[PDB]
Design a protein around this ligand. Structure first.
Ligand SMILES: O=S([O-])[O-]
Ligand code: FES
Ligand code: FES
Lengths: 159, 161
C-alpha cells in the first residue's frame, strides 16, 4: 500500500503557503522544493478541487489557502491528493459459492469488512487530529522563529 | 491508497481455516469462495512465506494455520499479503533547493514525516489489536454457531478430491 507520492509535496506546500502574505505561483513553489513544475501543479490542482487552495488569475496570480491553517487537517490534504476511497474495499466475497451468506443475513457488513473499517477509522482519526497550524508551530520550535518567514520572503520576491 | 486485493480473500481464508480439523487445499478454499485457484494460491503462498500457514504435502494435503487463531492478528495477515513497508516515505525534501535546511540541523525527522508516521502507527495498532479468534467469535455471534462448523465440514469433505 503506498500513499500517492504527491502527499509529501502537498503537505509541505500547505505549510509554506501559511507563510506567504500573497499568492504564490506553482512555478515558484516548485523552485523552492527543486521539483518538476508540471508535477507540483498537478498536486496543487488536486488541492484546488478539494477547496483547500484556490488559484486566482492574472500574472500576479498563483495559489492561496482558502481558509486558516487551523481549519485544514492532514486528513483534508491527504484525501484531496490521494483520494477519499478507503484502503480496504469489500467486494462481498461472502455472497459467493455454495455456502454463501444467505440474502437476508446481508444487512450487516461482513465482520472482516467491519474490523478493517475500524483501522481505517483510526488512521483517519489520527490525521484529522493534526492541523497545518500544528505543523507550523512545530517547525517554529525546531527550526527557529525566523525560518518560515525567511521562506515566505523568498517565495514572494518579485511580487 | 489501496491495499492489495488479495487481503480480503486471505482474511476470509484464515477465518474458515480455524473451523477445519484437517489440511484444506487452496483449490477447495477457491471453490468455497468461487475464485480462480491460481489466484487464491498466490495469496496462500504469501501467508506461507510469513509463517502463518504451512503446506502439507500429499494427496490429502493442503493448508493449515501454524498457530492458534488468538495469536494471529489482522496486522500479521495484512503485512503478509500487502507487505510491511510504510505507506508514507519521507524523501527529505526539506534538504532540497536554495533554502535547504542543514544536515547537522536535521537531527530529528521532519514534523510532517512524524505526523504521517503516527497515523500509520494508529492503523497498525488497530489491526494488531484484532485477532483471527476475534473474527471467528463475531461470525459465531452473527451467523449462528453452526455457520463456521458447517463450512469446516464442507472444506474437508472428500479430501483426495
Ligand atoms: O475436490 S472434490 O471435494 O470436488
Ligand atoms: S465479504 Fe468483504 S471482507 Fe468479508
Ligand atoms: S522532509 Fe519528508 S515529510 Fe518533510
Amino acid at each position: 500500500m503506498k500513499l500517492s507520492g504527491g502527499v509529501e509535496w502537498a503537505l509541505h506546500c500547505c505549510v509554506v503557503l501559511t507563510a506567504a502574505s500573497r499568492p504564490v505561483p506553482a512555478a515558484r513553489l516548485a523552485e523552492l522544493h527543486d521539483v518538476s513544475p508540471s508535477y507540483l501543479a498537478k498536486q496543487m490542482q488536486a488541492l484546488s478541487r478539494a477547496g483547500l487552495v484556490r488559484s486566482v488569475q492574472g500574472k500576479t496570480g498563483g495559489y492561496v489557502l482558502t481558509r486558516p491553517a487551523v481549519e485544514i487537517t492532514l486528513l483534508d490534504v491527504v484525501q484531496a491528493v490521494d483520494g477519499p476511497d478507503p484502503a480496504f474495499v469489500c467486494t462481498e466475497i461472502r455472497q459467493r459459492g455454495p455456502l454463501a451468506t444467505p440474502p437476508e443475513k446481508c444487512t450487516k457488513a461482513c465482520p472482516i469488512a467491519r474490523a478493517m473499517g475500524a483501522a481505517e477509522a483510526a488512521w483517519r482519526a489520527s490525521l484529522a487530529a493534526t492541523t497545518i497550524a500544528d505543523l507550523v508551530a512545530t517547525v517554529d520550535d525546531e527550526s527557529g522563529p525566523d525560518a518560515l518567514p525567511g521562506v515566505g520572503a523568498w517565495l514572494i520576491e518579485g511580487l
